[PDB]
Task: structure prediction
Amino acid sequence: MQATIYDLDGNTDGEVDLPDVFETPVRSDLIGKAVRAAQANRKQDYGSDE
RNA sequence: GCUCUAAUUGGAUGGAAGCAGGGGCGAGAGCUCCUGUGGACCGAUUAGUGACGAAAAUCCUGGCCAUAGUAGCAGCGAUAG
Ligand SMILES: [Mg+2]
Ligand SMILES: [Mg+2]
Ligand SMILES: [Mg+2]
Ligand SMILES: [Mg+2]
Ligand SMILES: [Mg+2]
Ligand SMILES: [Mg+2]
Result:
């Protein structure tokens, strides 16, 4: 498909090919999984005094 | 059903949470409304998180009732007024 390029006045100026990846089938399961992982990976270790 | 995180999305000084008493729903775990009190915070859905649910362990700590206006405040070679 084609994407409409805009200038700083908000007026259409030219257009470009929308790249193929924007046709990637949308997987909300895979997306949820990647997000859960990034969210987990910044959590800090903790525990009570041994 | 409980905690806290995230996204999405709501409620509150025109009165949140909690608590007391009461009305409705669910087989039920439990949900929800009304009144009073309270006087500042509280949810829902989804995906997570876990120090997550008690009637019991001679269980732990604290508080409290009965026991009870009961035992003792006599006994001793110093009977003390
Ligand atoms: Mg050890
Ligand atoms: Mg939502
Ligand atoms: Mg049992
Ligand atoms: Mg005790
Ligand atoms: Mg007696
Ligand atoms: Mg005498």
Summary: The longest strand of chain A covers residues 12-17.
